[PDB]
Amino acid sequence: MVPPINCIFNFLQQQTPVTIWLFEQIGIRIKGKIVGFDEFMNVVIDEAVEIPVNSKGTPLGKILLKGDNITLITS
Amino acid sequence: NGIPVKLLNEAQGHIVSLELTTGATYRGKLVESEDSMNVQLRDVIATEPQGAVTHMDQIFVRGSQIKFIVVPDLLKNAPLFK
Amino acid sequence: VSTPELKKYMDKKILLNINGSRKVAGILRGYDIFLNVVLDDAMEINNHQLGLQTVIRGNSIISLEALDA
Amino acid sequence: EHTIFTQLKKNIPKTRYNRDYMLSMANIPERIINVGVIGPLHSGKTSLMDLLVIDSHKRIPDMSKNVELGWKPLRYLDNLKQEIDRGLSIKLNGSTLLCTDLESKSRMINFLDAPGHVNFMDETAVALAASDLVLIVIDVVEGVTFVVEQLIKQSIKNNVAMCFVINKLDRLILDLKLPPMDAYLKLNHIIANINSFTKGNVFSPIDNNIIFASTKLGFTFTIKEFVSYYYAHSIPSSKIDDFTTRLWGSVYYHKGNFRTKPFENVEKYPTFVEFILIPLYKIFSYALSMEKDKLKNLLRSNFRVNLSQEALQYDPQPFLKHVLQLIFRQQTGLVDAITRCYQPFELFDNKTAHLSIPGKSTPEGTLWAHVLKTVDYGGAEWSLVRIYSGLLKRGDTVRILDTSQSESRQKRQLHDIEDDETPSCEVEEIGLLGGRYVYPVHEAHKGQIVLIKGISSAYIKSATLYSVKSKEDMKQLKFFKPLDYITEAVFKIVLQPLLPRELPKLLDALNKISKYYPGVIIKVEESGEHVILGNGELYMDCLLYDLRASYAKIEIKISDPLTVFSESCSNESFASIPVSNISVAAEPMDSKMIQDLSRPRKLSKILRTEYGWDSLASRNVWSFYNLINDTLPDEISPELLSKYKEQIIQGFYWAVKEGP
Amino acid sequence: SQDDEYVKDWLYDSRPLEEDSKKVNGTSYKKWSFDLPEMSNLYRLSTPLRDEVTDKNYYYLFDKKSFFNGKALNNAIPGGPKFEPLYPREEEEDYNEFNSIDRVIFRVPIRSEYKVAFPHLYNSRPRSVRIPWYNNPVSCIIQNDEEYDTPALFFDPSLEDFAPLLAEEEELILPNTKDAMSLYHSPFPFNRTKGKMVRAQDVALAKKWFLQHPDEEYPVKVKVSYQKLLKNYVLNELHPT
Amino acid sequence: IQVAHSSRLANLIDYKLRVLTQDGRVYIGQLMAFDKHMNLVLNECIEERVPKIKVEKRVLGLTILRGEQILSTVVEDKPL
RNA sequence: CAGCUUUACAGAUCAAUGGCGGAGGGAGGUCAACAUCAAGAACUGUGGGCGCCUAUAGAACUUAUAACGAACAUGGUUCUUGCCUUUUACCAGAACCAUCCGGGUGUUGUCUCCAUAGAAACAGGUAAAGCUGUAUUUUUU
Ligand SMILES: Nc1nc2c(ncn2[C@@H]2O[C@H](COP(=O)(O)OP(=O)(O)OP(=O)(O)O)[C@@H](O)[C@H]2O)c(=O)[nH]1
């Protein structure tokens, strides 16, 4: 078995490309690299980029995305 | 402890019905439940708000997104109540 | 308190029905008490793939229908 | 009327749960547990069963005042005149009880209180076969005897969930007068012994497999149950499981809010002793000794239980029992433990395979059921059958096969790999063995045991009944092997009827005995002398009683108790002597090899090699039964006369049966 | 005053327990309920007469049932009684092929001890034979040196702002509890602490002794007497009026 | 509609209860059992749904209604 | 330290509804009368379905090494025995039977010894007894 926390830790260690989907919001996504870790799914993510979904790119700085509104993580 | 949860647990085995917040009704053999209503079913149909049915083998469902669970009338008779 | 009994669904391909009428696919790798799924990545519902391995949050899950019996 | 008895009418003991619900539950598998409770002689399995029954039911007619009070044990399931008068549970007269768990939800449970005594181990074996979990009840005092070990081994062999009941704490509390610490130590020792006899699975009071019982005084409890009852008020929901885990394994309280694995100097005893055993002791002593008012007050305070004004005036032992009952609530803890033990239903398949052969599952295609033991439950013949798959309806036309004709059938099937329905019968009436009454039912579903009336007359002992609808289905099907009644029989009692006039009657009686008592070989010899090869002395006596009173009522002569002797050879055969109107050698096998035997040609050869390190040619030739038969001349490999030797081997079997 | 503290005041009174008390029904004197210590005292007093074996297994082949069996089978358990046989011994075997000394083997002597233990087996043509008991062993140790919960006669094993239940008890074993324990294992009369009153006639103090196996190194006459008593008892038991 | 002046929800067990929900549906049924988190067990439940005109009716039976989705509970009628 | 249910409390409007209501004894007698205590493990009614099923219920007592007795006598009858030779009076076993010395339980009725109130809950307090409680993903932040 591989827990979610463990996975998160691994991702952090890596510093590989991550693409986050927002909760209750289909049209917008985020794409960055995981820097932080918390007890909840909340993580700080430098080099983030906002993406409008194909139903391309937009300018965006360094961000911490809150745990409550996460959907997807991948790295 | 939650009496509805207990009831649900008891219903384990029976052909229960199950609607979500989305409004998509399921009907089938109840496999397993937990403290939070983390239901599983077997040999289960799935009808959307439109009415188009879709059959499926094994479904798991999370209690938060569950609206209400219909049990057969047999468990009205006994015995966890008193 | 109790762990989600998903040992039957371990290492099987599952259609995770998620918030906003969306869907995810993939083979099941791991899980925890909050129902945060860990699964090998697949296509989002014609169809197109993103990511290698994926970790889905518990709150977002509407359902998870087993593709493999 | 009758002397050996059941209820005989529909004024049955009414039940606290409604029976309809139970019936409904029995429809669906996964919500049925065949328990089959087992132990040594007078461990108290029957007592436990009785207690369970009492818990289930409202007001039972058979239970007098004295029994209710506590004094005499209600031995419920020993319903036979003999099993009463003798004191032994002799036959399988279990129960079907809707029993709740710690999780309030409830499940139907086919208990079977086997005999403890070691000559009815056939009965025990049968119970094991029936049942999917097995409660191994043990006398705390006597501890894990060899018998217990044997039972455990048997259970392991025929795949079953072993949920232990360490019974008769009262004896250590009061009879021995062990200090609480001493008692705890004893318990630990017992547990260790159990573990040792077991192959792998570690049993302890944590995990809810060991169950601490005192079935005379009328309480069973797993530590989990205790915790639920009495350590919820204090300890919050998060650490309750943790607390439970802590309790047993040599941890202490440290006079402080969290526990520690090291020994502490201020406090004396471990957590189990402090949080359970000590409390129990206190309860006991107070019940026996303390001022009544004070005791009542304590109950009101600590356990939150009130003694009735009538119950105060009780006599000591009865009072104690009552107190225990009040404290340790109607035995759900045990049920919970059982459930926990048998949370794996993947064992079921394994068990089935063991019973018959490595099976391809075909549930919807056909009904099939292991007829285990015939019984004379309510005077009339019923048959204790476990429906394994399908549903067995009343008035169904059903094919049956005695396990005698199982191996042969299998062979035939293999060979095959026209409809040859050899025998069959109609199901007259299905009923649930509910101890003293048979509550009747129309259906009978997968994974549950039941009494059926029509089957008995087909077979002798242990049948397989099935209702197919196809050739493919038939092909798929398998046939349960004959029950290995662990105790082999070597107590040879020879009969003759005293009045030859009524030889038919005697024969009938013998047949009945064979049907009912499974651990009974009945050789009808050439000399007009019937021979019974019973298991032991007591068992034999019981059988005789049954015959010479209930299943015949005849004056019958009986020999001195002999044994089945068996011929062998010490050295190897010296003379190569042929026979005419064949020459075969003789030499004993290896002792270890023999023992192994007691407990594909290439594969066989390999096995032989592993066992004794014999020659390969010998292995190749070999083809044994019952012992060993080779075909090891020179010209047999060239010759076709020696080839095709099944018929030849049949002849040998006769020789084996009846030696020189 | 020290040992027999409770009983002394009433023990030797015409009406053994006083009128107008909570320990008996009343002046009708039909029922009684006792406290523990008084009961204990009584038990202690009665050591001579109530001398009974707390071990139930002691009575193996001295059961009423066993006696009955013996009577049926015309088979004296040597200690116990003997009667006229139920059935006349019709010695008409006529040298048959069954039960011959040509046929059977004599490793065991088949004692008549074994007959009444497994009547239906070892005895051939048993008639009106009741079934006997077949029991567990009684490890029950009572301390005679005035000590409390001790492994004496046997051997040791090889190897959040709260407290346990019944905290603030401060003592496991109450001062009266040894006595209580003793009472517990004792037989019918004292086991209980409430009862219906029997007539002085309807108490039997001799009975118990004769039911027991006789104390060894007694004269022959005494043994005979004991046997007679047993016979008298047994007959009474057998034919219920 | 008539009903006694009740104090708590636990005291009015087995009364015929109307139950309003967030989606718009109205579940009528007798309250068999309650929860700390307002989950209700209903005896002979009937779902009344109002689409965007007139009350569409659906008979259910024994039902376990979750507390999250309930808006409020009105007493429709007495027991029996 | 919250909540609801009951007593002990004023003064209420006193409807509303419950519950204690034709609201009135208790303890006992070597006191009665009756009933009933060996039968399909066996109880009694009630309607309904039509001598039997299905719901209601009730149930005091006695029983599993089977009994009202943790107790034990004596008769009568046959049959077999024994001392014996006549019988009674006896021996000891059997089978039926009875008698007796006792026992409960229930209902009345009495006898004795102690005693005496015909109305209180609601709005909620005052005080005390019964149980429950101690916002970051599945309930209410
Ligand atoms: N001290 C004590 N005695 C018990 C306990 N449980 C049963 N007994 C007694 O010991 C014997 C065991 O009870 P039974 O139920 O007869 O034994 P069993 O389990 O039927 O034994 P089998 O006849 O072999 O099945 C009986 O004589 C009971 O009175 C117990 O917990 N403590």
Side-chain angles (χ1 to χ4, degrees), chain A residues 1-46 48-49 51-55 57-75, chain B residues 1-9 11-42 44-82, chain C residues 1-4 6-40 42-69, chain D residues 1-9 11-19 21-29 31-49 51-82 84 86-100 102 104-112 114-122 124-141 143-169 171-174 176-198 200-223 226-238 240-254 256-273 275-290 294-303 305-335 337-363 365-401 403-406 408-410 412-417 422-428 430-442 444-445 447-468 470 474 477-552 554 556-559 561-566 568-586 588 591 593-595 597-600 603-604 606-609 611-612 614-618 620-621 623-625 627-631 633-645 647-657 659-660, chain E residues 1-4 6-17 21 23-51 53-88 96 98-167 170-216 218-241, chain F residues 1-51 53-75 78-80:
Chain A
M1 190 177 289
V2 181
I5 292 159
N6 281 222
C7 218
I8 291 157
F9 251 109
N10 290 10
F11 298 150
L12 195 159
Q13 284 173 26
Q14 286 172 31
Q15 306 183 17
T16 27
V18 174
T19 64
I20 306 168
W21 286 26
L22 308 177
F23 181 66
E24 200 65 45
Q25 194 150 297
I26 303 162
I28 302 161
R29 292 173 191 173
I30 308 294
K31 295 191 179 172
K33 297 182 177 182
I34 295 155
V35 174
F37 169 72
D38 208 57
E39 69 191 328
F40 309 104
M41 297 285 287
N42 199 337
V43 292
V44 61
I45 170 159
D46 293 30
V49 182
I51 304 292
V53 177
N54 181 37
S55 302
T58 53
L60 195 154
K62 70 99 68 249
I63 288 192
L64 85 88
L65 198 141
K66 196 178 172 187
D68 290 35
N69 302 306
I70 296 167
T71 315
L72 274 67
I73 303 291
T74 183
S75 150
Chain B
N1 197 41
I3 297 164
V5 173
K6 279 166 160 185
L7 204 201
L8 179 60
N9 209 336
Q12 180 171 10
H14 292 89
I15 302 288
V16 305
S17 258
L18 180 59
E19 195 173 313
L20 312 184
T21 53
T22 55
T25 63
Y26 308 95
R27 187 172 185 78
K29 282 198 174 185
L30 202 170
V31 179
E32 184 176 32
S33 301
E34 296 167 54
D35 185 270
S36 53
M37 299 199 290
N38 289 171
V39 183
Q40 286 180 39
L41 304 93
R42 264 187 200 284
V44 76
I45 67 101
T47 75
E48 301 289 78
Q50 290 92 315
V53 309
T54 49
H55 195 94
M56 39 185 71
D57 295 31
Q58 267 198 299
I59 199 175
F60 171 97
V61 194
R62 181 189 166 82
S64 58
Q65 301 295 334
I66 293 165
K67 187 170 202 307
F68 79 111
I69 321 188
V70 184
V71 187
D73 294 45
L74 294 164
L75 286 80
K76 194 205 297 187
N77 298 24
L80 71 94
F81 308 128
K82 209 159 190 175
Chain C
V1 182
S2 57
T3 54
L6 308 175
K7 297 181 77 175
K8 304 303 296 189
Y9 303 111
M10 277 283 290
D11 310 328
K12 294 186 178 178
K13 205 173 194 70
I14 320 187
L15 298 168
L16 284 71
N17 204 132
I18 52 157
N19 188 236
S21 193
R22 297 180 294 183
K23 290 188 176 64
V24 189
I27 200 181
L28 195 75
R29 178 56 59 179
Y31 56 91
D32 75 323
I33 68 99
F34 292 107
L35 207 76
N36 299 331
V37 181
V38 181
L39 68 100
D40 203 288
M43 302 192 174
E44 317 306 324
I45 314 309
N46 290 25
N47 214 17
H48 48 273
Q49 196 181 330
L50 287 305
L52 294 303
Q53 51 263 37
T54 48
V55 182
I56 312 306
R57 184 174 157 95
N59 179 220
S60 58
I61 300 159
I62 303 298
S63 183
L64 52 108
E65 203 286 315
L67 201 161
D68 204 326
Chain D
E1 312 186 12
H2 47 26
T3 193
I4 76 186
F5 81 85
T6 199
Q7 287 302 329
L8 201 124
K9 199 252 165 180
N11 63 304
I12 296 152
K14 294 195 81 190
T15 312
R16 292 202 175 84
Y17 61 83
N18 66 328
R19 306 200 79 82
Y21 185 89
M22 186 176 70
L23 107 73
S24 78
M25 203 58 59
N27 185 36
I28 191 133
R31 295 300 231 73
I32 302 170
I33 293 177
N34 305 281
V35 164
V37 64
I38 272 108
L41 173 51
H42 289 303
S43 49
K45 64 203 79 53
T46 315
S47 186
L48 194 147
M49 280 310 98
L51 265 173
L52 244 145
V53 161
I54 292 156
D55 145 54
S56 287
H57 302 166
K58 291 177 171 296
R59 183 174 287 106
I60 313 171
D62 296 60
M63 84 190 299
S64 76
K65 181 61 173 162
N66 228 42
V67 302
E68 209 159 302
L69 253 64
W71 289 131
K72 297 292 186 72
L74 167 53
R75 302 194 307 285
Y76 199 68
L77 283 48
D78 68 348
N79 61 71
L80 287 85
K81 186 68 178 66
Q82 176 148 243
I84 283 182
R86 220 171 260 267
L88 311 187
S89 314
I90 281 161
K91 284 166 182 172
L92 272 287
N93 275 261
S95 49
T96 48
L97 303 182
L98 180 280
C99 317
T100 64
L102 293 169
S104 67
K105 64 93 146 164
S106 59
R107 195 197 281 90
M108 78 100 62
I109 299 190
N110 290 208
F111 286 99
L112 306 169
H117 192 241
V118 212
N119 297 324
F120 306 82
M121 293 288 293
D122 71 64
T124 305
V126 169
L128 270 144
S131 59
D132 40 60
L133 163 134
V134 156
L135 296 176
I136 289 170
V137 188
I138 291 162
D139 269 299
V140 172
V141 161
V144 182
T145 57
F146 206 92
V147 172
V148 172
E149 156 191 356
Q150 188 64 63
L151 283 167
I152 287 164
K153 265 189 170 61
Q154 232 307 127
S155 63
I156 287 165
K157 287 165 190 176
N158 76 324
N159 298 292
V160 151
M162 299 165 284
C163 184
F164 281 64
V165 193
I166 287 174
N167 193 15
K168 309 216 180 175
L169 296 185
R171 232 128 82 80
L172 68 61
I173 296 155
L174 300 175
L176 292 161
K177 309 180 177 183
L178 300 187
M181 189 57 192
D182 281 55
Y184 153 75
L185 290 163
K186 169 73 197 160
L187 283 168
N188 274 53
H189 183 263
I190 293 155
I191 289 155
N193 276 23
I194 287 159
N195 286 322
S196 296
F197 292 119
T198 315
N201 198 323
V202 178
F203 298 110
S204 51
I206 69 178
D207 206 55
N208 308 346
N209 283 333
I210 294 292
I211 306 155
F212 298 129
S214 229
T215 54
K216 170 171 80 73
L217 288 173
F219 80 107
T220 64
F221 87 92
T222 46
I223 67 98
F226 201 113
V227 168
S228 191
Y229 290 122
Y230 298 116
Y231 302 125
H233 294 269
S234 299
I235 300 91
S237 55
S238 298
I240 200 166
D241 295 13
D242 295 333
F243 175 74
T244 63
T245 61
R246 298 336 214 293
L247 283 172
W248 199 70
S250 304
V251 315
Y252 298 79
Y253 187 72
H254 191 209
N257 286 210
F258 230 73
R259 290 139 284 283
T260 184
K261 283 79 172 287
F263 179 85
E264 299 302 328
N265 303 299
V266 183
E267 184 166 300
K268 307 302 299 305
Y269 316 107
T271 43
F272 178 71
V273 184
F275 286 103
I276 290 177
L277 214 176
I278 282 274
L280 241 159
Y281 266 38
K282 280 170 181 181
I283 291 153
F284 268 51
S285 60
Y286 296 147
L288 295 193
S289 196
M290 193 185 211
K294 264 202 295 190
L295 211 175
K296 183 182 178 169
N297 278 2
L298 283 183
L299 294 222
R300 212 173 224 78
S301 300
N302 291 314
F303 301 94
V305 196
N306 303 351
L307 291 306
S308 302
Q309 210 284 327
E310 275 67 17
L312 290 168
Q313 296 190 319
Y314 271 22
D315 284 299
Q317 154 176 176
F319 172 71
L320 192 181
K321 155 160 194 160
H322 197 254
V323 149
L324 278 163
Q325 286 171 312
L326 285 169
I327 288 169
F328 299 86
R329 315 293 168 73
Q330 80 301 123
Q331 60 227 62
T332 196
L334 200 164
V335 171
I338 280 166
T339 296
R340 207 73 59 189
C341 203
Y342 192 56
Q343 77 180 319
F345 310 110
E346 105 293 317
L347 278 171
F348 162 82
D349 205 329
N350 209 323
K351 178 181 169 62
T352 229
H354 186 270
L355 265 281
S356 56
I357 22 272
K360 185 261 187 177
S361 56
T362 56
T366 181
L367 102 79
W368 85 316
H370 196 349
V371 178
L372 294 149
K373 228 173 83 82
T374 328
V375 280
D376 53 308
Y377 207 94
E381 282 182 6
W382 308 72
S383 201
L384 191 156
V385 191
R386 186 170 167 189
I387 283 74
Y388 266 83
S389 300
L391 45 77
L392 208 171
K393 291 204 170 189
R394 193 186 169 284
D396 191 292
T397 56
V398 179
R399 303 263 102 74
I400 315 156
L401 274 164
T403 54
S404 58
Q405 296 190 39
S406 178
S408 54
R409 268 281 176 175
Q410 278 300 329
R412 280 190 177 180
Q413 275 195 330
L414 288 160
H415 277 296
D416 204 328
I417 291 156
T422 29
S424 49
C425 272
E426 292 193 316
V427 170
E428 298 172 20
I430 295 176
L432 309 176
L433 34 48
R436 290 197 191 286
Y437 58 85
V438 179
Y439 180 66
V441 193
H442 294 290
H445 314 271
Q448 70 145 18
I449 295 157
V450 272
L451 306 185
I452 300 107
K453 275 206 173 200
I455 315 315
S456 60
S457 60
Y459 66 96
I460 295 218
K461 56 188 73 172
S462 59
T464 98
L465 74 72
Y466 59 95
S467 182
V468 292
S470 175
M474 189 264 180
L477 256 178
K478 61 280 256 184
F479 301 123
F480 303 105
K481 297 166 64 277
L483 293 170
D484 279 304
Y485 304 102
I486 181 151
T487 190
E488 183 58 35
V490 226
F491 203 89
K492 178 174 219 178
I493 272 175
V494 190
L495 304 189
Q496 285 187 347
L498 219 167
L499 300 173
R501 283 186 178 182
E502 310 307 322
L503 183 65
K505 289 193 177 175
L506 186 134
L507 265 149
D508 189 19
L510 278 172
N511 270 23
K512 278 187 171 179
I513 263 77
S514 86
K515 274 172 206 175
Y516 297 175
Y517 290 95
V520 163
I521 301 166
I522 299 170
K523 297 179 175 171
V524 186
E525 298 195 337
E526 296 179 321
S527 56
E529 291 175 5
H530 297 263
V531 168
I532 304 158
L533 310 176
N535 300 0
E537 293 180 51
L538 182 138
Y539 182 89
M540 254 319 306
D541 187 62
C542 288
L543 179 167
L544 294 169
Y545 168 71
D546 278 41
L547 201 170
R548 209 205 265 92
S550 41
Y551 318 140
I554 306 170
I556 287 174
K557 304 178 175 190
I558 287 201
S559 57
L562 317 183
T563 70
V564 182
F565 295 105
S566 62
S568 82
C569 39
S570 52
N571 295 31
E572 299 191 319
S573 53
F574 70 93
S576 54
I577 302 163
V579 192
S580 61
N581 298 307
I582 304 80
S583 52
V584 195
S591 54
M593 204 281 296
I594 287 162
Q595 285 169 13
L597 200 154
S598 82
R599 301 166 210 286
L603 292 181
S604 77
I606 291 155
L607 285 164
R608 264 187 66 78
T609 63
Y611 286 134
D614 301 54
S615 61
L616 206 141
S618 66
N620 277 28
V621 301
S623 50
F624 52 44
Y625 157 79
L627 262 277
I628 308 98
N629 195 245
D630 303 323
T631 307
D634 184 46
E635 298 178 33
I636 64 101
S637 22
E639 285 170 304
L640 286 295
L641 299 167
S642 186
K643 215 204 97 298
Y644 126 80
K645 66 172 187 170
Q647 221 300 129
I648 283 66
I649 283 165
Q650 280 192 319
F652 144 83
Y653 291 175
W654 285 33
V656 109
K657 282 183 180 66
Chain E
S1 62
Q2 296 184 36
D3 190 44
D4 297 313
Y6 296 87
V7 299
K8 62 173 168 177
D9 296 309
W10 45 259
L11 178 54
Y12 318 99
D13 281 52
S14 55
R15 193 99 308 109
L17 207 296
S21 195
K23 288 174 184 182
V24 298
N25 179 36
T27 329
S28 262
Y29 202 60
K30 281 205 174 95
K31 292 195 154 180
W32 58 269
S33 64
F34 268 42
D35 300 317
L36 179 65
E38 54 180 354
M39 188 62 51
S40 160
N41 283 205
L42 287 184
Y43 181 79
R44 213 172 312 99
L45 263 165
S46 309
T47 300
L49 294 161
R50 71 103 181 81
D51 178 41
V53 192
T54 55
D55 309 319
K56 203 191 205 80
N57 205 173
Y58 171 69
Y59 299 131
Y60 191 52
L61 319 201
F62 254 76
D63 262 316
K64 60 208 268 170
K65 291 291 178 174
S66 186
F67 291 137
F68 297 151
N69 291 348
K71 200 261 263 294
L73 274 50
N74 195 242
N75 269 316
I77 301 103
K82 50 203 77 182
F83 309 77
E84 269 232 313
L86 283 219
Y87 301 81
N96 283 17
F98 203 76
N99 296 328
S100 174
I101 303 195
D102 291 33
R103 307 279 189 286
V104 307
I105 317 97
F106 303 79
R107 300 313 310 170
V108 76
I110 183 169
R111 303 214 304 282
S112 177
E113 294 278 36
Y114 315 159
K115 276 165 209 302
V116 305
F118 302 124
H120 287 277
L121 199 170
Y122 283 83
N123 196 83
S124 55
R125 189 141 75 168
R127 295 130 152 174
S128 73
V129 193
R130 312 213 183 185
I131 311 308
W133 203 252
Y134 187 89
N135 203 27
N136 86 116
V138 183
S139 58
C140 286
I141 300 78
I142 302 163
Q143 278 101 136
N144 303 318
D145 310 325
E146 317 304 73
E147 309 305 322
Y148 322 96
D149 286 45
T150 55
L153 310 191
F154 45 88
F155 41 82
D156 227 69
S158 60
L159 304 175
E160 301 91 325
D161 305 308
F162 89 105
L165 271 196
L166 315 99
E170 194 51 41
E171 55 197 331
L172 194 174
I173 34 174
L174 291 182
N176 298 121
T177 206
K178 190 164 84 79
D179 294 324
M181 217 152 291
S182 190
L183 213 95
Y184 191 94
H185 303 304
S186 76
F188 168 49
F190 293 104
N191 198 332
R192 285 143 184 70
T193 62
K194 63 152 174 58
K196 300 131 65 76
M197 306 243 186
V198 288
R199 288 182 307 169
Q201 184 180 126
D202 300 347
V203 175
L205 305 171
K207 162 158 279 192
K208 297 306 191 186
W209 293 319
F210 66 68
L211 282 164
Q212 290 176 315
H213 215 104
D215 197 56
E216 211 54 46
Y218 267 152
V220 176
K221 73 174 184 273
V222 173
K223 280 186 292 201
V224 166
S225 75
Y226 263 120
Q227 255 186 46
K228 279 170 186 166
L229 281 159
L230 254 182
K231 182 228 194 76
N232 282 321
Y233 154 86
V234 157
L235 283 180
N236 279 307
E237 209 60 49
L238 184 53
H239 308 319
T241 57
Chain F
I1 304 167
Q2 301 184 237
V3 56
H5 213 261
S6 186
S7 190
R8 266 187 156 186
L9 187 72
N11 294 27
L12 51 76
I13 198 173
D14 311 320
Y15 280 68
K16 187 69 175 293
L17 262 67
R18 270 157 141 270
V19 183
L20 309 181
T21 57
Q22 288 188 331
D23 295 29
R25 296 156 174 77
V26 183
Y27 296 84
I28 70 99
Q30 303 174 31
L31 189 148
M32 294 198 72
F34 70 94
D35 205 334
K36 189 174 73 175
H37 304 268
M38 272 282 286
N39 290 36
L40 309 181
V41 182
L42 308 177
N43 191 285
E44 211 292 304
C45 190
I46 318 184
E47 187 182 309
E48 295 183 322
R49 196 171 65 77
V50 179
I53 303 162
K54 196 166 185 176
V55 175
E56 191 272 311
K57 200 172 187 176
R58 189 193 283 92
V59 180
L60 299 164
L62 177 53
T63 61
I64 295 164
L65 187 57
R66 188 169 173 78
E68 181 172 310
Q69 303 300 318
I70 296 163
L71 292 166
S72 58
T73 57
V74 188
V75 180
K78 81 190 189 175
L80 304 167

